[PDB]
Ligand binder design. Sequence first.
Ligand SMILES: *[C@@H]1O[C@H](CO)[C@@H](O[C@@H]2O[C@H](CO)[C@@H](O[C@@H]3O[C@H](CO)[C@@H](O)[C@H](O[C@H]4O[C@H](CO)[C@@H](O)[C@H](O)[C@@H]4O)[C@@H]3O)[C@H](O)[C@H]2NC(C)=O)[C@H](O)[C@H]1NC(C)=O
Ligand SMILES: *[C@@H]1O[C@H](CO)[C@@H](O[C@@H]2O[C@H](CO)[C@@H](O[C@@H]3O[C@H](CO)[C@@H](O)[C@H](O)[C@@H]3O)[C@H](O)[C@H]2NC(C)=O)[C@H](O)[C@H]1NC(C)=O
Ligand SMILES: *[C@@H]1O[C@H](CO)[C@@H](O[C@@H]2O[C@H](CO)[C@@H](O[C@@H]3O[C@H](CO)[C@@H](O)[C@H](O)[C@@H]3O)[C@H](O)[C@H]2NC(C)=O)[C@H](O)[C@H]1NC(C)=O
Ligand SMILES: *[C@@H]1O[C@H](CO)[C@@H](O[C@@H]2O[C@H](CO)[C@@H](O[C@@H]3O[C@H](CO)[C@@H](O)[C@H](O)[C@@H]3O)[C@H](O)[C@H]2NC(C)=O)[C@H](O)[C@H]1NC(C)=O
Ligand SMILES: *[C@@H]1O[C@H](CO)[C@@H](O[C@@H]2O[C@H](CO)[C@@H](O)[C@H](O)[C@H]2NC(C)=O)[C@H](O)[C@H]1NC(C)=O
Ligand SMILES: *[C@@H]1O[C@H](CO)[C@@H](O[C@@H]2O[C@H](CO)[C@@H](O)[C@H](O)[C@H]2NC(C)=O)[C@H](O)[C@H]1NC(C)=O
Ligand SMILES: *[C@@H]1O[C@H](CO)[C@@H](O[C@@H]2O[C@H](CO)[C@@H](O)[C@H](O)[C@H]2NC(C)=O)[C@H](O)[C@H]1NC(C)=O
Ligand SMILES: *[C@@H]1O[C@H](CO)[C@@H](O[C@@H]2O[C@H](CO)[C@@H](O)[C@H](O)[C@H]2NC(C)=O)[C@H](O)[C@H]1NC(C)=O
Ligand SMILES: *[C@@H]1O[C@H](CO)[C@@H](O[C@@H]2O[C@H](CO)[C@@H](O)[C@H](O)[C@H]2NC(C)=O)[C@H](O)[C@H]1NC(C)=O
Ligand SMILES: *[C@@H]1O[C@H](CO)[C@@H](O[C@@H]2O[C@H](CO)[C@@H](O)[C@H](O)[C@H]2NC(C)=O)[C@H](O)[C@H]1NC(C)=O
Ligand SMILES: *[C@@H]1O[C@H](CO)[C@@H](O[C@@H]2O[C@H](CO)[C@@H](O)[C@H](O)[C@H]2NC(C)=O)[C@H](O)[C@H]1NC(C)=O
Ligand SMILES: *[C@@H]1O[C@H](CO)[C@@H](O[C@@H]2O[C@H](CO)[C@@H](O)[C@H](O)[C@H]2NC(C)=O)[C@H](O)[C@H]1NC(C)=O
Ligand SMILES: *[C@@H]1O[C@H](CO)[C@@H](O)[C@H](O)[C@H]1NC(C)=O
Ligand SMILES: *[C@@H]1O[C@H](CO)[C@@H](O)[C@H](O)[C@H]1NC(C)=O
Ligand SMILES: *[C@@H]1O[C@H](CO)[C@@H](O)[C@H](O)[C@H]1NC(C)=O
Ligand SMILES: *[C@@H]1O[C@H](CO)[C@@H](O)[C@H](O)[C@H]1NC(C)=O
Ligand SMILES: *[C@@H]1O[C@H](CO)[C@@H](O)[C@H](O)[C@H]1NC(C)=O
Ligand SMILES: *[C@@H]1O[C@H](CO)[C@@H](O)[C@H](O)[C@H]1NC(C)=O
Ligand SMILES: *[C@@H]1O[C@H](CO)[C@@H](O)[C@H](O)[C@H]1NC(C)=O
Ligand SMILES: *[C@@H]1O[C@H](CO)[C@@H](O)[C@H](O)[C@H]1NC(C)=O
Ligand SMILES: *[C@@H]1O[C@H](CO)[C@@H](O)[C@H](O)[C@H]1NC(C)=O
Ligand SMILES: *[C@@H]1O[C@H](CO)[C@@H](O)[C@H](O)[C@H]1NC(C)=O
Ligand SMILES: *[C@@H]1O[C@H](CO)[C@@H](O)[C@H](O)[C@H]1NC(C)=O
Ligand SMILES: *[C@@H]1O[C@H](CO)[C@@H](O)[C@H](O)[C@H]1NC(C)=O
Ligand SMILES: *[C@@H]1O[C@H](CO)[C@@H](O)[C@H](O)[C@H]1NC(C)=O
Ligand SMILES: *[C@@H]1O[C@H](CO)[C@@H](O)[C@H](O)[C@H]1NC(C)=O
Ligand SMILES: *[C@@H]1O[C@H](CO)[C@@H](O)[C@H](O)[C@H]1NC(C)=O
Ligand SMILES: *[C@@H]1O[C@H](CO)[C@@H](O)[C@H](O)[C@H]1NC(C)=O
Lengths: 442, 47, 48, 124, 124, 124
Amino acid sequence: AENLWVTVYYGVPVWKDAETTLFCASDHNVWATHACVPTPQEIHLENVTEEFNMWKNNMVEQMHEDIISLWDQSLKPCVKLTPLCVTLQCTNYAPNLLSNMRGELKQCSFNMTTELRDKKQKVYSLFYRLDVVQINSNKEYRLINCNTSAITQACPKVSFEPIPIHYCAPAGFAILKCKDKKFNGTGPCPSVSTVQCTHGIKPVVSTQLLLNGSLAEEEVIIRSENITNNAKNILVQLNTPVQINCTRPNNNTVKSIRIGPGQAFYYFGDIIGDIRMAHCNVSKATWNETLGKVVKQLRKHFGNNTIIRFAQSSGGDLEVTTHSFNCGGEFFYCNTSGLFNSTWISNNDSIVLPCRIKQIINMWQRIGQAMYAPPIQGVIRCVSNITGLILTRDGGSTNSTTETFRPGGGDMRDNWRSELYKYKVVKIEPLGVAPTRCKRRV
Amino acid sequence: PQEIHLENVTEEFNMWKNNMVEQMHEDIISLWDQSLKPCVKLTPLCV
Amino acid sequence: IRSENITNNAKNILVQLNTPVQINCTRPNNNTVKSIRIGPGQAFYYFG
Amino acid sequence: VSLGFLGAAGSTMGAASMTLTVQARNLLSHWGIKQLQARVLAVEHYLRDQQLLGIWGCSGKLICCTNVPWNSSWSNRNLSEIWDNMTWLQWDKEISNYTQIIYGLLEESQNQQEKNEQDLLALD
Amino acid sequence: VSLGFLGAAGSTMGAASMTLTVQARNLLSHWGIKQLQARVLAVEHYLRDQQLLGIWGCSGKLICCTNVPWNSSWSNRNLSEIWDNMTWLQWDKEISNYTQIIYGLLEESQNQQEKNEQDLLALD
Amino acid sequence: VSLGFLGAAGSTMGAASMTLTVQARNLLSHWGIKQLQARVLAVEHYLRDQQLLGIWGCSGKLICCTNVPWNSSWSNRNLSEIWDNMTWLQWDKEISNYTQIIYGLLEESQNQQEKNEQDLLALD
Ligand SMILES: *[C@@H]1O[C@H](CO)[C@@H](O[C@@H]2O[C@H](CO)[C@@H](O[C@@H]3O[C@H](CO)[C@@H](O)[C@H](O[C@H]4O[C@H](CO)[C@@H](O)[C@H](O)[C@@H]4O)[C@@H]3O)[C@H](O)[C@H]2NC(C)=O)[C@H](O)[C@H]1NC(C)=O
Ligand SMILES: *[C@@H]1O[C@H](CO)[C@@H](O[C@@H]2O[C@H](CO)[C@@H](O[C@@H]3O[C@H](CO)[C@@H](O)[C@H](O)[C@@H]3O)[C@H](O)[C@H]2NC(C)=O)[C@H](O)[C@H]1NC(C)=O
Ligand SMILES: *[C@@H]1O[C@H](CO)[C@@H](O[C@@H]2O[C@H](CO)[C@@H](O[C@@H]3O[C@H](CO)[C@@H](O)[C@H](O)[C@@H]3O)[C@H](O)[C@H]2NC(C)=O)[C@H](O)[C@H]1NC(C)=O
Ligand SMILES: *[C@@H]1O[C@H](CO)[C@@H](O[C@@H]2O[C@H](CO)[C@@H](O[C@@H]3O[C@H](CO)[C@@H](O)[C@H](O)[C@@H]3O)[C@H](O)[C@H]2NC(C)=O)[C@H](O)[C@H]1NC(C)=O
Ligand SMILES: *[C@@H]1O[C@H](CO)[C@@H](O[C@@H]2O[C@H](CO)[C@@H](O)[C@H](O)[C@H]2NC(C)=O)[C@H](O)[C@H]1NC(C)=O
Ligand SMILES: *[C@@H]1O[C@H](CO)[C@@H](O[C@@H]2O[C@H](CO)[C@@H](O)[C@H](O)[C@H]2NC(C)=O)[C@H](O)[C@H]1NC(C)=O
Ligand SMILES: *[C@@H]1O[C@H](CO)[C@@H](O[C@@H]2O[C@H](CO)[C@@H](O)[C@H](O)[C@H]2NC(C)=O)[C@H](O)[C@H]1NC(C)=O
Ligand SMILES: *[C@@H]1O[C@H](CO)[C@@H](O[C@@H]2O[C@H](CO)[C@@H](O)[C@H](O)[C@H]2NC(C)=O)[C@H](O)[C@H]1NC(C)=O
Ligand SMILES: *[C@@H]1O[C@H](CO)[C@@H](O[C@@H]2O[C@H](CO)[C@@H](O)[C@H](O)[C@H]2NC(C)=O)[C@H](O)[C@H]1NC(C)=O
Ligand SMILES: *[C@@H]1O[C@H](CO)[C@@H](O[C@@H]2O[C@H](CO)[C@@H](O)[C@H](O)[C@H]2NC(C)=O)[C@H](O)[C@H]1NC(C)=O
Ligand SMILES: *[C@@H]1O[C@H](CO)[C@@H](O[C@@H]2O[C@H](CO)[C@@H](O)[C@H](O)[C@H]2NC(C)=O)[C@H](O)[C@H]1NC(C)=O
Ligand SMILES: *[C@@H]1O[C@H](CO)[C@@H](O[C@@H]2O[C@H](CO)[C@@H](O)[C@H](O)[C@H]2NC(C)=O)[C@H](O)[C@H]1NC(C)=O
Ligand SMILES: *[C@@H]1O[C@H](CO)[C@@H](O)[C@H](O)[C@H]1NC(C)=O
Ligand SMILES: *[C@@H]1O[C@H](CO)[C@@H](O)[C@H](O)[C@H]1NC(C)=O
Ligand SMILES: *[C@@H]1O[C@H](CO)[C@@H](O)[C@H](O)[C@H]1NC(C)=O
Ligand SMILES: *[C@@H]1O[C@H](CO)[C@@H](O)[C@H](O)[C@H]1NC(C)=O
Ligand SMILES: *[C@@H]1O[C@H](CO)[C@@H](O)[C@H](O)[C@H]1NC(C)=O
Ligand SMILES: *[C@@H]1O[C@H](CO)[C@@H](O)[C@H](O)[C@H]1NC(C)=O
Ligand SMILES: *[C@@H]1O[C@H](CO)[C@@H](O)[C@H](O)[C@H]1NC(C)=O
Ligand SMILES: *[C@@H]1O[C@H](CO)[C@@H](O)[C@H](O)[C@H]1NC(C)=O
Ligand SMILES: *[C@@H]1O[C@H](CO)[C@@H](O)[C@H](O)[C@H]1NC(C)=O
Ligand SMILES: *[C@@H]1O[C@H](CO)[C@@H](O)[C@H](O)[C@H]1NC(C)=O
Ligand SMILES: *[C@@H]1O[C@H](CO)[C@@H](O)[C@H](O)[C@H]1NC(C)=O
Ligand SMILES: *[C@@H]1O[C@H](CO)[C@@H](O)[C@H](O)[C@H]1NC(C)=O
Ligand SMILES: *[C@@H]1O[C@H](CO)[C@@H](O)[C@H](O)[C@H]1NC(C)=O
Ligand SMILES: *[C@@H]1O[C@H](CO)[C@@H](O)[C@H](O)[C@H]1NC(C)=O
Ligand SMILES: *[C@@H]1O[C@H](CO)[C@@H](O)[C@H](O)[C@H]1NC(C)=O
Ligand SMILES: *[C@@H]1O[C@H](CO)[C@@H](O)[C@H](O)[C@H]1NC(C)=O
């Protein structure tokens, strides 16, 4: 009796951290939700501490690579589009238009194989000045990446809209989430809880700003890794959104030519209307208000007395130097100048921003694949909900010499790290034994 | 085989609303064009 | 020795050694390569 | 009350010993591959130790106490603070080593011996 | 005689209560995908509620009657025509909207209370 | 000693009857297709006759002595050399035919008749 005896228990609530895969669940055809599982039961936890660690999370990786594999799963069974590289006889289109729209929109001309093999065909189109490069009268031209990759077009009936997505773990695993308002990367969260499957995320490709995204709580924050180290980048998140409108001002018809056996092409037709360019309005005062708020925040991390300066982009290629994002089946590239123009010390109108557009993109930083994008008949409107941005810094000198900030970015992986920081999935273990006063029984 | 006869029981059928008609109707599609794929690509027969 | 059928003369013969003997060879020539693009985005190498 | 899945995990062992079915019921409850990968994963990650609790002589229930003594050299702690102060999250740590000699000595000393006595005594 | 699988399904409950293993034995008895899809499907649809009656205190047997009374507010029918006139296909209907409180107060009130009485009486 | 998996397989039955968990514990312990193929056959090749074991009235244990006599026309061998001279690799051969009527009258004369004596004694 005073000798004790061990007994079994089953279902003791303990966990250990591990890693397995997860699965997507949500509720014409888009990339994502062709076939998944349709869908709460949140359970609050208490009297327990836990130490989080983002940037060592794993789920960022497998979601980052299966959306790679999803994206180039999608384009494959549409048309292999090879013979689009013969020389281009080409000129600037429509001179004596002495506006800001001068170098834009060259018109070009070429040869193309017919439906039947031996005959030839001549057909004519418009392109943008960033699309096509001359090699060393007209000049001869080829578009920017006929070499070192192939090209193929997205077959026109599918859509590019981002559906929200839920991520969810299988059984024997658990979703834990910190319910603190303020959170700064890592820390012990005294109020954590569990869920079965994560909330919604709309994974839209973005560079230099986050768009139609999730908000934060009443105090704006920063997140980094190395904070005095300066190698890597800096994420911020606002509390209240500001808005944005832009558009493309043209009506711009299309035409259709077959190439070979049973295939279809679309090229950019000709311009009805006038000639303008894409520009994007923002509210001036609200923008100043929010950026003064975010710098008044981040002065905590660089001393209360120092001078801070905002500068433009550095350079490099176009893919890092400007804010770029799709809208409705095209691609944008604006100038992004007049919002990093200010300096800062201790003591109704809008803002225009010019914006060019490109026709074929090579994203993912993976050279070898390149998509063609069909132009869209009709006018375009595009509104958004503005949230957060990304930032980097330069080198410098001793710590009084007016630190300077620039919008940087480039890498795709951090684009999600802004919105699944609050998640950690873990493996339960239900078996345990313990001594007790069970007078041992036959 | 092993067919089993039943007794003292009724049931109301519903043809034209069956689902297996569809299932086999589409996997015979996928079987048919599965079969022809790895043999000859025959393009240049149009001059 | 190992065969399947030894009186049958149709098939082949296996044996196995008990100690290894060794083998050296090589190609004695210093060689070059050059890279020529084929069409869209492809790379070729030939013997220089 | 029945709080939920992994509910009373922060509380003491006695309150945790009160309600346990909420862990049992939720233990089983181109891109098809990881669906079918997850499901086989989960089902035998369940019943690997369902069968190895089945060899432990109480496959049916969730708490059985069998014919095996306790070695005090594992821990010399009196019964009170075992069940009153330490919780389960701490408890696994100090027997994180002896776990194999638990699982070793457990039923190789029992589920033969008790049914050796069954096969030789009460079927005699 | 042993008719076959789902054999006596039209007959009354008492004759249906006579033979039941004919339902038990048949319960587990490019185009590879739905084969592997179907097999995992069948085995999980089996042992989901195999463990859900394994929790019900008589995991081994096929019929057990445990320590729980009956709410007469569910139905007031005397024992005779329950077992003599109504068959199983009718029987599930009138306890369709209730089955959850069956499964509710069935499990959480029994396999604890009897095992609380284990841990406190028979092991005192 | 515990030799290993299929350890004492050449020895006599009585020594083989001493240690048996070593067979139990090892029993569950582009090219992705056949790993996922192997695992599903492994788990359900196990529990096909685990459930057929479960219907044999002693789902928990590994040896149970139930209420069924023996047709002596199967074999008339005196008890000694049953357990002293013949080993298991021989033993399966001479009952390789009656194995169906073994499984036939196994529990369809027991978990049908001990069923019925539950049903009308223990259920009574
Ligand atoms: C950011 O937020 C915006 C919020 O507006 C969000 O949604 C957009 O909403 C509008 C409003 O519905 C969508 O615009 C159009 O809706 C009209 C309804 O009359 C349709 O005419 C349009 O397309 C139809 O017509 C085509 C011509 O044949 C068909 O091919 C097509 O299938 C449609 O039937 C169109 O739907 C608009 O689509 C969305 N999306 C966008 C990108 O504007 C927006 O999605 C959020 N995200 C981003 C990244 O902007
Ligand atoms: C697309 O291919 C067609 C088919 O060949 C081209 O038509 C022919 O193109 C050639 C060279 O481009 C032309 O030949 C040149 O004509 C002048 C005329 O005097 C001559 O001086 C040159 O020495 C040479 O012969 C030819 O006229 C033309 N037409 C015919 C009926 O043969 C077409 O030009 C191609 N389109 C392009 C390259 O944009
Ligand atoms: C395939 O063809 C494309 C386009 O013809 C090549 O891209 C271009 O490569 C040239 C290489 O001479 C680069 O030109 C450089 O431009 C900078 C502009 O700042 C200039 O300062 C340099 O003197 C030089 O001329 C250029 O980076 C690049 N893009 C453009 C728009 O010209 C590509 O290299 C070719 N090869 C492969 C393997 O892709
Ligand atoms: C070697 O392989 C083959 C089959 O795998 C067998 O080889 C030869 O088989 C022939 C045909 O039976 C034999 O020849 C004659 O067979 C007739 C049958 O009527 C018999 O009447 C003759 O007297 C003669 O045997 C022959 O013996 C045999 N071997 C040779 C040619 O070397 C043979 O079964 C295999 N060897 C084995 C299994 O050892
Ligand atoms: C994140 O915010 C929390 C808010 O509680 C900070 O936690 C404490 O902050 C005080 C400030 O003086 C420190 O002295 C404590 O050491 C912090 N707590 C602990 C347990 O260390 C935390 O410092 C903030 N972290 C970052 C990286 O900003
Ligand atoms: C962050 O930057 C510091 C800056 O030097 C890195 O290097 C060590 O820095 C400390 C300052 O505490 C020096 O005293 C050491 O002498 C440096 N190294 C050596 C060899 O002594 C640090 O490595 C950086 N990296 C991170 C992420 O912190
Ligand atoms: C963005 O700002 C421009 C510039 O103010 C606006 O353009 C005006 O549009 C109206 C409508 O056709 C014209 O009558 C005006 O002449 C335009 N220019 C000016 C200077 O007012 C535009 O409406 C704004 N909004 C969007 C979505 O582009
Ligand atoms: C853009 O161009 C289209 C193409 O011409 C215009 O649509 C035409 O509008 C007239 C006016 O009623 C109709 O009679 C034609 O039938 C329309 N054509 C087609 C193909 O539908 C359109 O008006 C232009 N402007 C805008 C703002 O869309
Ligand atoms: C975006 O706009 C800025 C502002 O005009 C451009 O930066 C100017 O570039 C020219 C040519 O190098 C310089 O001479 C100017 O000094 C720069 N600033 C000014 C005041 O113009 C920039 O080139 C444009 N394109 C982008 C996105 O860099
Ligand atoms: C094979 O030929 C190569 C090509 O000349 C030789 O490599 C050169 O060796 C000289 C001697 O120092 C260097 O200065 C050159 O820079 C080398 N060139 C390259 C491209 O590496 C090489 O030595 C020759 N012999 C071998 C490989 O045995
Ligand atoms: C969270 O922790 C607090 C303090 O540890 C728990 O407080 C209870 O306090 C009453 C007051 O007399 C005691 O009777 C209870 O026994 C305490 N419970 C425990 C578990 O210690 C509080 O209940 C805890 N929360 C939960 C859900 O158990
Ligand atoms: C309880 O604790 C240990 C665990 O095995 C046992 O102590 C061993 O005793 C033997 C006998 O001399 C020594 O050779 C070992 O070195 C001891 N330690 C270990 C770790 O084995 C002790 O005998 C156990 N008591 C019982 C009853 O089993
Ligand atoms: C943006 O466009 C919408 C279109 O409905 C309009 O209502 C709004 O006034 C515009 N401006 C702002 C600042 O939102
Ligand atoms: C910044 O915002 C303040 C309002 O708090 C205002 O005084 C100032 O003019 C704004 N500056 C710009 C450039 O918008
Ligand atoms: C820095 O400024 C913040 C701004 O409110 C203030 O709260 C804090 O006390 C200051 N700390 C130091 C060390 O100056
Ligand atoms: C900042 O705004 C003023 C006002 O137009 C302008 O003169 C200046 O060039 C701007 N700076 C940049 C970098 O565009
Ligand atoms: C944008 O912010 C507004 C503020 O009400 C919010 O209602 C809306 O849900 C957010 N999203 C959109 C697309 O407006
Ligand atoms: C092969 O060449 C090597 C060179 O290292 C030499 O040492 C060796 O003797 C040669 N012969 C063998 C391995 O039979
Ligand atoms: C039980 O353990 C506590 C822990 O310090 C101790 O104070 C108490 O004296 C112990 N009781 C007995 C009877 O040993
Ligand atoms: C307990 O387990 C750990 C895991 O690393 C092992 O390293 C340690 O040796 C075992 N602890 C001891 C010293 O028994
Ligand atoms: C079928 O119903 C009739 C009606 O009385 C009955 O006589 C017969 O026994 C029933 N058969 C079975 C197999 O239940
Ligand atoms: C039967 O269920 C009803 C449902 O509310 C309940 O009110 C009643 O008390 C139950 N009967 C008994 C005897 O508990
Ligand atoms: C049993 O139910 C029948 C159904 O009408 C009824 O006639 C009979 O009286 C009931 N028996 C008792 C004892 O209530
Ligand atoms: C019984 O179940 C059905 C299924 O539709 C449900 O709609 C109904 O509300 C439940 N009926 C009642 C009245 O409880
Ligand atoms: C093997 O056979 C010999 C023959 O007597 C016996 O002594 C020995 O015990 C046997 N081995 C085993 C493992 O039973
Ligand atoms: C034993 O089985 C045989 C099988 O044919 C049968 O003929 C014989 O009657 C059986 N004996 C008894 C006693 O049942
Ligand atoms: C037992 O079986 C052996 C096997 O041959 C035999 O020699 C012996 O006589 C048998 N004993 C009896 C009592 O029949
Ligand atoms: C016993 O089983 C074997 C297996 O082939 C079968 O051939 C035989 O007919 C059965 N009965 C006899 C007489 O062996």
